[PDB]
Design a protein around this ligand. Structure first.
Ligand SMILES: *[C@@H]1O[C@H](CO)[C@@H](O[C@@H]2O[C@H](CO)[C@@H](O)[C@H](O)[C@H]2NC(C)=O)[C@H](O)[C@H]1NC(C)=O
Ligand SMILES: *[C@@H]1O[C@H](CO)[C@@H](O[C@@H]2O[C@H](CO)[C@@H](O)[C@H](O)[C@H]2NC(C)=O)[C@H](O)[C@H]1NC(C)=O
Ligand SMILES: *[C@@H]1O[C@H](CO)[C@@H](O)[C@H](O)[C@H]1NC(C)=O
Ligand SMILES: *[C@@H]1O[C@H](CO)[C@@H](O)[C@H](O)[C@H]1NC(C)=O
Ligand SMILES: C[C@@]12CCN[C@@H]1Nc1ccc(O)cc12
Ligand SMILES: C[C@@]12CCN[C@@H]1Nc1ccc(O)cc12
Ligand SMILES: [Cl-]
Ligand SMILES: [Cl-]
Ligand SMILES: [Cl-]
Ligand SMILES: [Cl-]
Ligand SMILES: [Cl-]
Ligand SMILES: [Cl-]
Ligand SMILES: [Cl-]
Ligand SMILES: [Cl-]
Ligand SMILES: [Cl-]
Ligand SMILES: [Cl-]
Ligand SMILES: [Cl-]
Ligand SMILES: [Cl-]
Ligand SMILES: [Cl-]
Ligand SMILES: [Cl-]
Ligand SMILES: [Cl-]
Ligand SMILES: [Cl-]
Ligand SMILES: [Cl-]
Ligand SMILES: [Cl-]
Ligand SMILES: [Cl-]
Ligand SMILES: [Cl-]
Ligand SMILES: [Cl-]
Ligand SMILES: [Cl-]
Lengths: 534, 534
């Protein structure tokens, strides 16, 4: 072993690059391969382990981003473009990135990031995901993986082995297997790996907790604005098949057999599958994505609900939470009456159009039930109330209530739960005020962007980012976000009985209980009973 | 014409009695017959007009009270005994009472009182109904009628003419016909008659507004805590028949034909029918009575809802309202966990037992819907919240929301609506504090008991009674409760658009809007759609 930027792993030697960070420096090994390129006849198939290489792998520059739908609703606007691929797109995209403190640690806490983006998009190379601030400030080895999204990672024709489904989840598991096998050479302790992600990434984290084939590969888990049981996170095998066939029908494919269909889908260039991706959804809806995990009986033994009830899952500690206005993004992009440069005050007619779009699987009784629940009939024509009420409908149904069901089911068997409610609106936010604390905007605090002066955050925001980075890192390290024997206020543990949680903002810590119970009893207990009876 | 206490009517001469009232005096003609005694083969039949008499009728003492169930839940307790018959009970009970100012007016405003008591009880002779205070203070001719209740006034075997149903309503209409024909001789103006009643009496008033055969007999209407469309106020002809047959089955009657059944029921003494009256209800329930008006296609042309929608009803002015805690009486008497001498804090189990009892016709989804709606899940085990929530369930479902539906349907076609919310708890109340402002306790203010010193009301309460007596009387007289060109605050008119109403207490008048819309949209629009779909 010669240099600090050279590391010999079980797959071959890797050469990194020194990176500047807050007046200091650390090491980064970017673009390390963990699977063979899922190209050609490999498209839609399970990932294959990367064949070991001779010589030295150049790990000094980020890798390609997986083929995905690109958002151009607001061309040039940073608010939306900070999420788009910032590297060239390619089906050859299964790589991982590692940020190592300097000098190289011997056996320190490890954190693996799993990006979100509704399983149809996402990149490990985004600026808000730069792990050098976290690695540096908290001295953890920070890993960020990648995984096939869209049809590429989730086209599902159950029964077939050419496109069984969930391969994007299997891509994640292989990156986690590689971390388990090689993170030691980078100074990481494979027995103290914490996986964390946001949105589809948080749902993924929860899916690795559930899937028996993934449990042994990590120690602890953090989930941000995502839960495995989210209504948009999975589909039955019948629906997945139905959508795969419909995708084929959009490309004038032969539909006589799975082989015919799959072969045809494999002959198409990437952008061709992406171009008709959204045409397969079964309803006019928001917060619904075409290709997602399928409850196959393999990666997922049984229905998610029976697994949560039987305690059929990994038991450990978890730290999770949600943002105050999870729904605003999805209404801005597809609900009538909402627009980026307007206060978007909503009319009674658009409110109702929005309820229909938000609970696509509901019948009329169900739609009325929802409307009754979120309408102030003492002032039903208040455009701001209609807007905010619709925002909460989308956030409660799609993120918060599903996470609260998961939190409650998990706590009965887990070894420690820490729940947070993130409600701070960034001072340099480019989105309109009506969107509030947006889906995905706690991430910048988790990765420490506020400590970077040029980004223009207030001093209190830098403080908030530090507390957060330290809660996350201390939790990953010990199973508890609080410092042992500290003076600071204690984030209390979430219990079945007390159900406490804390707010996460620039104000002095404050503890609360039963996060949105009223609305969540509606969403998790009532509405489903109603839909199953009618 | 010789004396002030002697009056010659179209039915014969009547002799009254001078009565003392607040240091002064007035005349009272008590026990005037308006129908032939519905005795013997007359039981269950339509009322027959009283055959004119020779000589002078002694109208100096109250008449008998109709045969009815007598309440002995709290023997000796005034709170419950002030509602029980205070005269001997008899099937010979169709009489009316008149209080005439002195000196006798020539043609003044007339008010006719229709007592309540769920159509199974009630008397025109109760102390809280003494009309001398109102007649005196407001100089109106005050009439109080009587009508058969229980099986006697509402046994219904549609198709038959021996017991067609609604005869108790027909008893009321005949008393109103007699007032139309003879009130002139007592100084009353038959063209300015206002009918008013509480509970079943208020529902009756609304039924006379609906029934084309009753409309021409009165000018205006006042309804207190009752509405024709209340869930307990009527039954289909099938259900009435079903209950009449079940009553017969309780007395070991022959059930082969209506004639057999009716003849048998006619051979039984009164107390025998009363003794098994409650055994015919179809569900374990509260706020439900055995024999009530039937939607027969005669007195009621069509369903109450289609009549309200088509505007098929008398168009005039109406003044109506409800009390703050309508449900407490019915929970005290039959819901588990409630008792007279306890604070009655309710357990989650009794709350649920109570929901079942309160919405007897509901399936499980419906029961859950109700529970979800009235449960504070942030503190579901608060015994006081469970108690009060259950109180509102009973009041909203049985009185307030049905009245608000009626108010809204009526206003689209009426000539003026005045709505009130009575929320003052009497200072000398003998019932426990948890019952609040009880069903039936605004009556004592409407009849002016507070002006009687010996009854122990505060000075402010005497003031409240006077404003109320004067709103009622001024409304009966002109169609508007407000004084023309007055300094006092104005009770605004209730409109389809603004929906304003006022509170009625000892505080300075205050106007509000949309009385209990949130809960009433639930009860009037949502729940029924839910029950009709499931
Ligand atoms: C997490 O699991 C640990 C170990 O399974 C729990 O610690 C045990 O707690 C019981 C009760 O105090 C003791 O009898 C054992 O000796 C403990 N083991 C050790 C090594 O500490 C711990 O209580 C669990 N924590 C939570 C929040 O459930
Ligand atoms: C109650 O009815 C009366 C009479 O039908 C209404 O009075 C009429 O109002 C219109 C509009 O102002 C006038 O053109 C008529 O000349 C009025 N008639 C009389 C004799 O006043 C009155 O508006 C109605 N009130 C309510 C509250 O609906
Ligand atoms: C590593 O590869 C990148 C590819 O563009 C190149 O820019 C860089 O100079 C290379 N470094 C070495 C030592 O190969
Ligand atoms: C009227 O009848 C009642 C019946 O008890 C009696 O007390 C009263 O004295 C009678 N008066 C006359 C004049 O008949
Ligand atoms: C990761 C993000 C945050 C918002 N921008 C990115 N795009 C997207 C789409 C869906 C989702 O749930 C989450 C996301
Ligand atoms: C008239 C009263 C007021 C409470 N005491 C009398 N009894 C009774 C029963 C039912 C009802 O709706 C109303 C009543
Ligand atoms: Cl920097
Ligand atoms: Cl779903
Ligand atoms: Cl096929
Ligand atoms: Cl489709
Ligand atoms: Cl859309
Ligand atoms: Cl739950
Ligand atoms: Cl929950
Ligand atoms: Cl921003
Ligand atoms: Cl802005
Ligand atoms: Cl930023
Ligand atoms: Cl909940
Ligand atoms: Cl007196
Ligand atoms: Cl009903
Ligand atoms: Cl019969
Ligand atoms: Cl029965
Ligand atoms: Cl009962
Ligand atoms: Cl209504
Ligand atoms: Cl209404
Ligand atoms: Cl009292
Ligand atoms: Cl008391
Ligand atoms: Cl009294
Ligand atoms: Cl309403």
């Amino acid at each position: 072993d010669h240099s600090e930027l050279l590391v010999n792993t079980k797959s071959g030697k890797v050469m990194g690059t020194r990176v500047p960070v807050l007046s200091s420096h650390i090491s980064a090994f970017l673009g390390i391969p963990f699977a063979e390129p899922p190209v050609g006849n490999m498209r839609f198939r399970r990932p294959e382990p990367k064949k070991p290489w001779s010589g030295v792998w150049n790990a000094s520059t980020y890798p390609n981003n997986c083929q995905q739908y690109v958002d151009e609703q607001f061309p040039g606007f940073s608010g939306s473009e900070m999420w788009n691929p910032n590297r060239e797109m390619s089906e050859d995209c299964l790589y991982l990135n590692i940020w190592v403190p300097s000098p190289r640690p011997k056996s320190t806490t490890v954190m693996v990031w799993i990006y979100g983006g509704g399983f149809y998009s996402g990149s490990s190379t985004l600026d808000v995901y730069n792990g050098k601030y976290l690695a540096y400030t908290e001295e953890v080895v920070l890993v960020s993986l990648s995984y096939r999204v869209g049809a590429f990672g989730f086209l599902a024709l159950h029964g077939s082995q050419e496109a069984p489904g969930n391969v994007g989840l299997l891509d994640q598991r292989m990156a986690l297997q590689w971390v388990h096998d090689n993170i030691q050479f980078f100074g990481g302790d494979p027995k103290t790996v914490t996986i964390f992600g946001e949105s589809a990434g948080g749902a993924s984290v929860g899916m690795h907790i559930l899937s028996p084939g993934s449990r042994d590969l990590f120690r602890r888990a953090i989930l941000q604005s995502g839960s495995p049981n989210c209504p948009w996170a999975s589909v039955s095998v019948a629906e997945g098949r139905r959508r795969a066939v419909e995708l084929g029908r959009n490309l004038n494919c032969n539909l006589n057999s799975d082989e015919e269909l799959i072969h045809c889908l494999r002959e198409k260039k990437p952008q061709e599958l992406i171009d008709v991706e959204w045409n397969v959804l079964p309803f006019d809806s928001i917060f619904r994505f075409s290709f997602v995990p399928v409850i196959d009986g393999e990666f997922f033994p049984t229905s998610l609900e029976s697994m949560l009830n039987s305690g059929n899952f990994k038991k450990t500690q978890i730290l999770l939470g949600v943002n105050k206005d999870e729904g605003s993004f999805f209404l801005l992009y597809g609900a009538p009456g909402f627009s980026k440069d307007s206060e978007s005050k909503i009319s009674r007619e658009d409110f109702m159009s929005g309820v229909k779009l938000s609970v696509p699987h509901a019948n009329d009784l169900g739609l009325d039930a929802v409307t009754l629940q979120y309408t102030d009939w003492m002032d039903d024509n208040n455009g701001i109330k209609n807007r905010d009420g619709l925002d909460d409908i989308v956030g409660d149904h799609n993120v918060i209530c599903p996470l609260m069901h998961f939190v409650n089911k998990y706590t009965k068997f887990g070894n420690g739960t820490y729940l947070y409610f993130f409600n701070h609106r960034a001072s340099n936010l480019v989105w309109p005020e009506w969107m509030g604390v947006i889906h995905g905007y706690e991430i910048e605090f988790v990765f420490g962007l506020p400590l970077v002066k040029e980004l223009n955050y207030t001093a209190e925001e830098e403080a908030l980012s530090r507390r957060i980075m330290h809660y996350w890192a201390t939790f990953a390290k010990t199973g508890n976000p609080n410092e042992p024997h500290s003076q600071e206020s204690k984030w209390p543990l979430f219990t079945t009985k007390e159900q406490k949680f804390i707010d996460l903002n620039t104000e002095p810590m404050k503890v609360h209980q039963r996060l949105r119970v009223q609305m969540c009893v509606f969403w998790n207990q009532f509405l489903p009973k109603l839909l199953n009876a009618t």
